[PDB]
Symmetry: D2
Subunit: 454 residues, 4 copies
């Protein structure tokens, strides 16, 4: 029942990188798995010899496009599953999520009148933090498939270092498919947009989006009338991202680039540090300072303007637009009060970060029926508030970071489908937080396109 | 006061072309100048040695694009001065007309969702027919600058064969400039469309066109957001056309192409035969049958379905879509009754003509103040009727043929500027029929774009 | 305590099965006898196939359809096929440097071949799945069950490692998908750039002992590239590099589990690769391998060695190109340099007369293998070049198209094939003989071969 | 009764005059003495200038700005300038065939030069206005006032025709605009296609008596083009052909009347052409021609013959490139093949030390003219080639850029220059000596020169 891998039995890092990497990893690290060190080492030794998920030239390219976002010349769409699972790492599922991002992106592009950088939560989003080590059933908490199992039994919840290699296998398989898919017919704007027009026809609030959908279609037809063939467009790039949480995994996937040599985390193109692991003197922030990838930090409602500035100065020490993304997650009822003084203070530093809205993690609650859930209207209202904040300051609302899937799940309440607490039981499939289903994700893109237009 | 040209003192036509050309020109020809034959010959001998205004490969290309029009895959915009004059053959004027066509074309392209073929009435529109040889002042009628002078005195109205060479000089100069202009910054869609947005801001009915103007701007911005640079578009082609009226001029500008050899009239890319010279057994129709250029015939209210068919069978004997354009000029109050049976009968033949609306020549009347004029609303209503006719039959409304200028003249009544009979006296500059000024021409394009959309 | 980590293969729910009609066709084909198959228990094989039936595919049908179009152009004399990579991939060497080196060598070869042929070169790597090999003897020189490639057992000369382990099917898939991922990343990186890739060809000329021989062509290629640039052709404005994946379809357990239905018409594609070939020891006309190739939509190839008859050749054409699709079938000649000029012409004539258009591809390696006095299995560069030379002569005489080459190469500076400008000797072989099977052309030899074939395309 | 038709020049209302400040500057410049001007009455000249002030321009400022950018690239060593066409255009020969033949020859030369130089070639024709020439003697060998070109008087050797006729200004404009129209049509026709144009270079090699000499390069160019095509470069996906117009700015009446203001910054452009040069006999440092060149925005050139000093050269640089704009000024060497290697280096060194970047262009014709024993004025192909050879040597020795050539050519198979592969003799000259002024390279000679210069660019 096991495939078995041989433990390799080789370029030394430049002395300074070895020193800084060691210092970063010696700092305290929250939310790490508790598995034996000798077993972790063996797994990392396997991962240090595998082909990388991404390569440095792609990360450099992403950095260039994120700079444009930071400068107000592009918009960032980041999205995908809350938690990828080994079980659902399948072609239909992956294609569903790629398609939903593409569908959203064309609508946002038209509304923003500028390019949309597409970053999927995919090919590595297998680890999550927990506030409690014992869950509501008295079991050790599920921390994602890189760590332990979702099944509600003790043995499955044991931390298993073999999941580090299993997670890489799943991630590299998914990434291969994402690459194949973005240079397939799935890339074509016309294909992708006719999907949106089917969505408009079947949605209960379709008549509401019909005008913009038609306008987009006429735009695409105009492009074609002017002689623009699909043969000669910017062909689709979808980048890979996840939360950099398990440092055993991230450190094993570091590779030294071939103009000074730098350390790149090649488990992804970009990674972010979450609320529970962003300790300013912690290993995760220190790890982010050593790697060359673009990075994000999640900023919740206890964020101060002063700490935001300290993240900016530590994480973008050389003033490189787009290197750092600050991901606002303040709850729809607070975003308007809490965000402006953070934005003002950071902007005064002269650094150019991307300001990205995560309207999901600040707006979750537990339904009467037991399922943890989010209301579509709160998610939409946070994005609305985020846009108001930036428009008042004249700063750039740079992007959104959403949890979505191309499946017709029943996880977040509301939308045009008016998903109720009752409906939640029928198709609740997430291993963790509730995702916008394909219709809700589409509807949000339309709604956000209008915010971009106004 | 004269430049003087030496009379050349040389490839024989294939025997069949010489025979057919001679037969065509021996047939009766209406509306020809009355100047001595020996003087005409000398002028034609000069014109037989000049560089051509157009070349065969451009005419072949136009034919390819007109085929697409005939098949329902493109739309034809034909427009420019009623009568070009030597006096106004200037850079500002020519640029004005090129700009007005470009402005109209972008709007029509967006509305049609397909390419617009642009054919200017330019670089040769120097001759006109007259129903009376003596005009309202008792003078011999002005027949255009290729024939005689506009000035109201006897001597200026004498027919002067030297105007054949003078007309070529003016035509080749204008064509040179048209070519320079269509590969200048004037070509750029963004430039051209910001003009339309200034028009929207200053028009008295601007609020009416604002929505479509914004929609176009968002379409252009989307194109740019998708990575379409102006560097890599279909760069502007504007073709040259005039009424083939003076056979001394047209025959002198024939050239034998270098896959069988054919006769091309290189005074223009396409030419049309007017109402007063379309005698079925006449020299003009017979001349049109010998040349390889695409051709049009104007069809007025006494047109029968049967005669239309005879034109089609004589002028498109080989069934080449786009070779023939049938130009409906029935008056706004008749187009709806008269056009359908012509369309039905021609369509039954299996030939594919372009159906083009000329909403001007069927709707002219004399104002109380003396000036010959047309009402904007009748012009618009004829185009509207033309579209209704085709939509009922499921045939392709292929194009419009309008008389326009990029100057702010006061020649046609109405439009958003509400030009009245009083206003007509202030800026009436046409050597012949009243042209839509730059604002009216633009407004019509918007109106026609909506017909194309509905 | 023995330097291994086990990776749980959790059972996960199955996606919908393939259509009953197509599975009916498949079962009939696979009831045919299959040579050279692993001996592992059926129940274990089934469990592992079940895992593979639900994994993300290595390739997708639209790429296969695109390859088929490019291979049609090859069959019609309008493109040239370059196929190459390791004789056997190993899991141990399935690393970034090794993959990058093989991708690089193939690109280096292709630009030289493109110039020489004055037509596009279709690039198909032996990569992301070449993990199984037949054997003639069930017992090797060490008295062990033979190594059958990493999909089946281990190279290490010990009993435990040599047992047939069906878990290696899944390990094979993990390695194929990781490699394919990287091949995709590399072909859209700076590695794709013609200028970058041809500068490497320039360093090669400067340092090769016989570089003076190739300088003329290398300079001429550089001048061609600079002309492109001078006419205003930007490198982003070219056909961006496609490298397809291929291997020998040997382990039917693996291939059948990697079958998928196209989205739609709908039919079976083997998504473990873009194209696969059938080997000399598994091409029985009524065997399971040919039957499997009949059922799949991918372009396929069949190796043709010196025992081939024109009649059997014709039977392959009738079974595997029944719809007369140009380029769907490639016939790969491996007759030895001393036999190709005699044995190939009758095969070609007979196939051409069928009215089908196959690709005629030259494998100049597998017919020219010998053993050194110092032990190592080896091939002579000159014999390899000479078979391709003879292959061109055959087609030139017949007015037929020499479609392409199929070679075993690596971007490593190994010492596996004798000869080349480096004059690799029998003594030298012991330095870096790293192949887990047949001797490969090293990076210099492979690049030197491309220059030589470029000259053969120019005459 | 004498085979002429008069074309009325109707007076038409004037458009707005040029700005007063700019006309003030112009008047100050044109008060300077002007050599070689027609003697026609001032009042008639004025009337004709008034007509020309309102005609559509020959060129537009955006094309001139684009040329200036391409000429900057030449000045910096990143492109090569090809300038060529008739020594004198005549109204009688300003026909479609003749224009097409000259455009064709220039394109044929440019593709060969592009390959050889491994960089873009800027194509500037001597066309659409080269209708005026200076003379040394006011009385010719027939006892007549000298022919001054068709803008001024008639070639025919009779008194009436030789009188200076200001109507010829308008006839010149009519002919320039007709020619420019056609040049524009031709450069966006199939004549633009690299393949078409290079096939002509292939026929030329096959039939030239010394074609064996050029076959290698011709084949190599063809292989480069086929490589482009093989890498997927479609001919519609290239920089579509631009051919600019130039002539010697000689008749100040014509040039000043063709001045226009750019739309906007705003400044004077001479829209009778894209670029104009000042000749050897009108380049007085304080004369009207240099002053006129100062005032206009177009790129300009100055001919530099064997009397030139480094100091005067430097004065041209200071007057005509006062803002240090690379490529705004071209210095055109015409020192004779026996003198260029001695006379050019001191001029170059001195100009380079100024810190300005001019274009160094070689005119290998006007310094190598002699008369045959059979009467005809002529030039030797070998002397022409040799000046360009010597010009390259000068720049190679100095590390400076040989910017381009300026040659007199036609697409006609005339017999005007001795030598070339056809070995044109003194006897042969009488067959087709058709130039109204200096002897031109015929189509074969001009194409042969391009191969030879291509080799000089390759070394
Ligand atoms: N070198 C691979 C290591 C590997 C590749 C891919 C993978 O998913 C896991 C492990 C092996 O020995 O198997
Ligand atoms: N594998 C990393 C550091 C490393 C070492 C060497 C190298 O080339 C890349 C990355 C660790 O956790 O120490
Ligand atoms: N060959 C021209 C003929 C010509 C050209 C242009 C023109 O506008 C009129 C006449 C000449 O002799 O003048
Ligand atoms: N110039 C024309 C006919 C013609 C003759 C010869 C030629 O090459 C073209 C056209 C005429 O009126 O007779
Ligand atoms: N869903 C995957 C199946 C898989 C994916 C990738 C892989 O390399 C092996 C197996 C799992 O259960 O782990
Ligand atoms: N408006 C023109 C001026 C002109 C145009 C073209 C030309 O070749 C000469 C003169 C005319 O009066 O005729
Ligand atoms: Cl890289
Ligand atoms: Cl599906
Ligand atoms: Cl042509
Ligand atoms: Cl103006
Ligand atoms: Cl079975
Ligand atoms: Cl053995
Ligand atoms: Cl004056
Ligand atoms: Cl003389
Ligand atoms: Mn989440
Ligand atoms: Mn009219
Ligand atoms: Mn092998
Ligand atoms: Mn000369």
């Amino acid at each position: 029942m096991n495939w078995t891998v041989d433990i390799p039995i080789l370029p030394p890092l430049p002395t300074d990188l070895r020193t800084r990497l060691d210092a970063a990893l010696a700092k305290p690290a929250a939310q790490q798995p508790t598995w034996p060190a000798d077993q972790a080492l063996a797994m990392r030794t396997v991962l240090e010899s595998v082909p990388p998920v991404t390569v440095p030239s792609e990360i450099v390219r992403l950095q260039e496009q994120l700079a444009q976002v930071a400068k107000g010349e592009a918009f960032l769409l980041q999205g995908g599953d809350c938690a990828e699972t080994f079980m659902d790492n399948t072609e239909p599922h992956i294609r569903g999520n790629v398609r939903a991002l593409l569908q959203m992106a064309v609508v946002l592009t038209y509304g923003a009148s500028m390019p949309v950088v597409k970053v999927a939560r995919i090919a590595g989003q297998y680890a999550k933090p927990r506030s409690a080590d014992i869950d509501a059933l008295g079991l050790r908490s599920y921390r994602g498939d890189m760590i332990n199992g979702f099944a509600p039994d003790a043995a499955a919840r044991e931390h298993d270092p073999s999941r580090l290699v299993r997670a890489y296998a799943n991630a590299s398989a998914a990434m291969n498919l994402v690459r194949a898919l973005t240079s397939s017919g799935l890339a074509s704007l016309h294909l992708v947009h006719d999907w949106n027009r089917e969505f408009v026809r079947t949605s209960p609030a379709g008549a509401r989006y019909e005008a913009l959908a038609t306008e987009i279609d006429r735009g695409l037809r105009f492009m074609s009338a002017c002689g623009v063939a699909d043969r000669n467009l910017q062909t689709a790039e979808i980048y890979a991202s996840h939360e950099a949480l398990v440092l055993d995994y991230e450190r094993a996937m570091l590779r030294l680039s071939d103009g000074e040599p730098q350390l790149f985390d090649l488990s992804a193109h970009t990674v972010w540090i979450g609320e529970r692991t962003r300790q300013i003197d912690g290993a995760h922030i220190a790890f982010a300072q050593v790697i060359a990838n673009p990075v994000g930090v999640k900023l919740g409602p206890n964020m101060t303007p002063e700490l935001a500035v300290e993240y900016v100065e530590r994480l973008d020490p050389h003033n490189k637009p787009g290197r750092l993304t600050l991901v606002s997650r303040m709850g729809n009822h607070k975003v308007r009060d809490l965000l402006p003084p953070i934005v003002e203070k950071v902007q005064a530093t002269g650094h150019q970060v991307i300001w990205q809205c995560d309207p999901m993690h600040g707006n979750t609650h537990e339904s009467s029926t037991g399922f943890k859930t989010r209301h579509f209207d709160r998610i939409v209202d946070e994005v609305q508030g985020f846009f108001e904040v930036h428009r008042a300051l004249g700063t750039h609302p740079g992007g959104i970071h959403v949890e979505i899937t191309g499946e017709n799940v029943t996880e977040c309440l509301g939308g045009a489908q008016d998903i109720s607490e009752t409906d939640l039981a029928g198709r609740y499939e997430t291993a963790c937080d509730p995702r916008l289903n394909t219709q809700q994700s589409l509807e949000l893109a339309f709604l956000v396109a209008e915010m971009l237009r106004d």
